[PDB]
Design an enzyme around this catalytic site. Structure first.
Site, PDB file in Angstrom:
ATOM      1  N   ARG A 185      21.597  83.798  55.262  1.00 25.04           N
ATOM      2  CA  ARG A 185      20.442  83.405  56.049  1.00 25.04           C
ATOM      3  C   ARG A 185      20.862  82.667  57.338  1.00 25.04           C
ATOM      4  NH1 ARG A 185      17.268  85.355  58.656  1.00 25.04           N
ATOM      5  NH2 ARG A 185      17.155  86.909  56.973  1.00 25.04           N
ATOM      6  N   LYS A 196      14.305  75.260  80.590  1.00 27.32           N
ATOM      7  CA  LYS A 196      13.301  75.487  79.548  1.00 27.32           C
ATOM      8  C   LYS A 196      13.962  76.148  78.335  1.00 27.32           C
ATOM      9  CE  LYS A 196       9.121  75.644  82.456  1.00 27.32           C
ATOM     10  NZ  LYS A 196       9.682  74.938  83.626  1.00 27.32           N
ATOM     11  N   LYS A 206      12.394  67.945  94.074  1.00 28.31           N
ATOM     12  CA  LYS A 206      11.018  68.414  93.844  1.00 28.31           C
ATOM     13  C   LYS A 206       9.967  67.606  94.616  1.00 28.31           C
ATOM     14  CE  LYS A 206      11.753  70.440  89.256  1.00 28.31           C
ATOM     15  NZ  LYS A 206      12.403  70.020  87.970  1.00 28.31           N
ATOM     16  N   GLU A 210      12.979  72.351  95.770  1.00 31.78           N
ATOM     17  CA  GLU A 210      11.782  73.153  95.526  1.00 31.78           C
ATOM     18  C   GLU A 210      10.737  72.900  96.607  1.00 31.78           C
ATOM     19  OE1 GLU A 210      10.135  72.909  91.624  1.00 31.78           O
ATOM     20  OE2 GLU A 210       8.902  74.704  91.954  1.00 31.78           O
ATOM     21  N   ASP A 228       8.201  77.871  94.952  1.00 33.14           N
ATOM     22  CA  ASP A 228       7.221  77.660  93.902  1.00 33.14           C
ATOM     23  C   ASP A 228       5.920  78.388  94.206  1.00 33.14           C
ATOM     24  OD1 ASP A 228       4.908  76.533  92.566  1.00 33.14           O
ATOM     25  OD2 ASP A 228       6.281  75.013  91.759  1.00 33.14           O
TER      26      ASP A 228
END
Lengths: 280, 276
Positions: free
Chosen positions: A102, A137, A169, A198, A219
């Site tokens: 597994r 992410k 940012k 960004e 963006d």
């Protein structure tokens, strides 16, 4: 251009396997105790086409449970495995094998999953000059593991984290003054780091270009604005496009010819590959 | 019947958060130094309907980074969060917050994802007597986490691992013997037997198994099974089940449905942290 994760460090493979085995095994596989204590044979199939990723982990699972289990790999990490093909073969103890099972395929399922997502997007944009970048992410604890999968599938690595590269940012631009300030301070601290800004605007883009950034993230620009940007940036700054991109929007964007397309989807979600261990 | 996971043990949460911070932060967030060393405010919003899971992890992240951040939860673990609703509010230091953000989001988007998928399936079988069970097809290191995300979403926990319950599969399998030797070694555990057909089910019932897992039955054979097993053994149906096939199986009346899809796949909830 960032460091590329072409192998996951051993200590990270080890610790991830260790903790995986524990959470599952604790005091012992009680049902394995019902099997003959003998050697046998086994093999693992995909039920679907896939980009393999996970050799190192599977290997490390074997290694940690029973070094006696012999493994032979028919495919290696970063290969396209055809549906219904055998990826590896096992020879060893029934109980060990039934226990290793597994955990082993939970790593391949996942990482091959990640690699296979990436490859799809990549084949989608193979006709254009654009490249695929990943993001932060990520599944916690699987930062490097997923950077590796993404590389395995055709994608290249955006910054690993908060340390290897600069990402300026709105939140950062707002503070300590806007863009020119931000980049300038950022070079002053460490001149060896990639500075990225960004932006939401063509005007902000001009700023970041004027401030001599290394790459600029767009963006949520419209198609048209992406077009404008490319003209503006050609020969000046590298361009990376972000705007919740998936298999359904990437081609339109890639037709613009921006250098890079950022995609969180390739790590954020998981479509696990369907595997099976045939033991006998 | 089995142990249900209504909380993730602290150290698991601690060790997870620690390693995920380390892997992101290393020597320190270099871009945060450009930001003002000032207090500010922030809120986290969901961009879709969702079941919430990961409080413990968000909190724990805060605690490891900067205990000076104040968090207020508008929704707690296992609630239905409406699209565009704020989940929590932060009052704190700009730098700490900018640095904590992604790890924070990365947890909620993942576990709420697991809880959300799970919830969908539950709603689908809402009108039947059938209950949802999970498997061991989880993310390495998130075994308990996802058993919890599943509970959060309306689903119930199959055994946690290989240690807490028996699962006699083809490989261990004959049946009579295998069950008998299990109760010998340990009369105190659930004995489950996975079967491929009706004759094996008879064997497992005849051997007084606790619960029986039907591996890839036709509808028809599931029907028969149900009939056979009423008042004898609990039934659980495994057969690569998704949102597209679960209803047909639930209509049969079997007690439990086994779904690995709820944990082996991940559909991350879309989130954003609006700082300021």
């Amino acid at each position: 251009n960032t460091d590329q994760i072409n192998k996951v460090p051993n200590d990270i493979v080890t610790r991830l396997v260790r903790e995986s085995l524990a959470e599952d095994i604790a005091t012992g596989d009680i049902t394995a105790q019902l099997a003959e204590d003998i050697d046998t044979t086994a093999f693992c199939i995909t039920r679907e086409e896939m980009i393999l990723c996970g050799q190192d982990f599977a290997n490390e699972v074997i290694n940690q449970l029973d070094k006696n289990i012999q493994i032979t790999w028919l495919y290696s990490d970063a290969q396209k495995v055809p549906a219904n093909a055998r990826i590896f073969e096992l020879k060893g103890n029934v109980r060990s094998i039934l226990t290793a099972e597994r955990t082993i395929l939970n790593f391949i399922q996942m990482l091959s999953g990640t690699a296979t997502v990436t490859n799809k997007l990549v084949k989608l944009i193979s006709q254009y000059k654009t490249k695929l970048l990943d993001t932060r992410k990520t599944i916690p604890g699987f930062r490097l593991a997923q950077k590796y999968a993404v590389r395995c599938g055709g994608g290249f690595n955006h910054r690993i984290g908060l340390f290897d590269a600069y990402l300026i940012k709105e939140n950062h631009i707002r503070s300590a003054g806007g863009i020119a300030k931000a980049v300038t301070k950022a070079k002053k601290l460490d001149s060896n780091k990639v500075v990225e800004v960004e932006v939401t605007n063509l005007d902000e883009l001009n700023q970041a270009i004027a401030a001599k950034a290394d790459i600029v993230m767009l963006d949520n620009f419209s198609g048209e604005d992406i077009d404008i940007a490319v003209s503006i940036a050609r020969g000046k700054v590298a361009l990376e496009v972000s705007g919740n991109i998936d298999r359904n929007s990437i081609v339109a964007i890639a037709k613009t010819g921006v250098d890079f397309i950022s995609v969180g989807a390739i790590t954020k979600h998981i479509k696990a590959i369907d595997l099976s261990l045939q033991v006998q």
